[PDB]
């Protein structure tokens, strides 16, 4: 692929449950994509223009643990399945695509970078299909064009019989 990615974990359980409860995260925040957890689920946020964006089926209407206590959504749009918090200092903010490319790259929670064919405003097909369990936890993850700009964030897999062949996504125009 043309983009590479790696993860670095920042907390595990005890730190997780304790920080959701308290709402204060003193950790140093880095990188273009935040890995997120709540009690029940796991998902991604993509930093675009100073907003951390993720899927409403994952964050609900929750605050995001921050340096100075819990951070309030500044964007909450249930039908689009989109929410937005002002990104914490440290986040690497990315930029909206304008090249209109149809070669896209999905970045997953594991930092794989997998090729996607843009098919509509909000649909993209996996060039090589994957098991759906491999995309699990990756909602909110970025779809990249080949110069590394946001075309959208990952919403849901389209899957028959446990293999994922396409993906719905929230097109960055929505953000």
């Amino acid at each position: 692929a043309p983009i590479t990615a790696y993860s670095q974990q920042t907390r595990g359980l005890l730190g997780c449950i304790i920080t959701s409860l308290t709402g204060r995260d003193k950790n140093q925040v880095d990188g273009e994509v935040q890995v997120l957890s709540t009690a029940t689920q796991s998902f991604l946020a993509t930093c675009v223009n100073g907003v951390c964006w993720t899927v409403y089926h994952g964050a609900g209407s929750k605050t995001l643990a921050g340096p100075k206590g819990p951070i309030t959504q500044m964007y909450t749009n249930v039908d689009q399945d989109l929410v937005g918090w002002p990104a914490p200092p440290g986040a690497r903010s990315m930029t909206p695509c304008t090249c209109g490319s149809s070669d896209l790259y999905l970045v997953t929670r594991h930092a794989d970078v997998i090729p996607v064919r843009r098919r509509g405003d909000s649909r993209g097909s996996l060039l090589s299909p994957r098991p759906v369990s491999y995309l699990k936890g990756s909602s909110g993850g970025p779809l990249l064009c080949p110069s590394g700009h946001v075309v959208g964030i990952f919403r849901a897999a389209v899957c028959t019989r446990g293999v994922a062949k396409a993906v719905d996504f929230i097109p960055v125009e929505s953000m």
Binding site: I3, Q9, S20, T22, G23, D30, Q34, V35, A65
Partner: peptide, 12 residues
């Protein structure tokens, strides 16, 4: 109950 940054992905 607040969402928590449990890790991050660095882009290249």
């Amino acid at each position: 109950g607040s969402v928590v940054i449990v890790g991050r992905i660095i882009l290249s």
